[PDB]
Amino acid sequence: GIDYIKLLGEIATENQFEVTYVDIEEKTFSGQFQCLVQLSTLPVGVCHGSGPTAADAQRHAAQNALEYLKIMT
Amino acid sequence: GGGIDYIKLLGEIATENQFEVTYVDIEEKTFSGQFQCLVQLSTLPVGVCHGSGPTAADAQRHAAQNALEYLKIMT
Amino acid sequence: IDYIKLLGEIATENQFEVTYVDIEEKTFSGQFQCLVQLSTLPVGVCHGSGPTAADAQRHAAQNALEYLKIMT
Amino acid sequence: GIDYIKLLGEIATENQFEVTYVDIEEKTFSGQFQCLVQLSTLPVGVCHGSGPTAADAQRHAAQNALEYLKIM
After folding, report:
1. Distance from A4 to chain D by nearest Cα, in Å?
2. Do C66 and A36 touch (CB under 8 A)?
3. Residues preceding chain discontinuities in chain B with C to N over 2.5 Å
4. Which residues on chain A are in Cβ contact (under 8 Å) with D24?
5. A–D contact (≥3 CB pairs within 8 Å)?
């Protein structure tokens, strides 16, 4: 049948949205599978960090992002 | 044993400002050989759309169908 | 069960808004489709189908009650 | 040894994005000068730098932005 997943993909990107599928584990009352589709605006910012370990790189990245948010409200 | 806990602070501030934080560990190293991480900042989704079906795939297809109808209403 | 009444009661209690939108165009199989929006955070959106506009709305409310369970 | 600030500027010109430096008034935990550099890429890339002088902090932010542009 009509591929809504693909069509949604086209229309969402074309309107600058991102699409995230979440499969829910709990069924409906009638025993059916449930899915949530998230529409997001394009992300705000990508902040960079580097360090001697992956942990340090992550933590430095967070450092950068804190400062960025402190400045961009 | 100390220092500043950036991941926790970033967590808190992001939350009060309604952002979600995603850590991405990068494959390549810097020139001096150090690890790289990207922190991606995104907002709470505009809409979360629901779908149900007899199979997980159907639940996905119905969820998409709903999202398309919703997108029509906001565009 | 009257799902529209129950959804409305849950909304007034938990202080959010419920907006029904009767989609003018029909589904691929030619049925009445309705959309319900919850002013939750994030905003919740569910879909309903049926032989009348009333049935579509009830099914949308029904699904909205499912959505709320998912999100505690 | 290398002009990172200049190099980043040039890359910004040919890729048609802007580069903005912000000197942060608070020092880091260890007491160093702090700098943020923003790239008006989509999404906006943001890099941080640190040093004994504000100037070194800028040079390190630009250098990190060069590392950043190689992985986007």
Report:
1. 27
2. no
3. none
4. 67, 71
5. yes
Handedness of CA B75, C4, C5, C9 (dihedral sign): negative
What token pair was written down for B28? Answer: 């390549």
Closest CA to D42 of A15, A19, A47, A46: A46
Helix/strand/coil for A47: strand
Is the bond preceding residue D43 a cis peptide, omega within 30 degrees? yes
- The residues, ordered by sequence, that sit 6+ positions from C66 with a Cβ below 8 Å of its Cβ are A28, A29, A34, B50, B52, C46
Compute chain B's Rg from CA coordinates.
19
CA dist., res. B63 & res. D34, Å (int):
46
Give the CA distances from residue B14 to residues A33, C23, C55, D49, in Å, rounded to whole numbers and listed in that order.
Answer: 32, 36, 41, 21
Domains of chain D: 1-72 (3.30.160.20)
Please provide residue C12's backbone torsions phi and psi, each rounded to the nearest 5 degrees: -60, -40
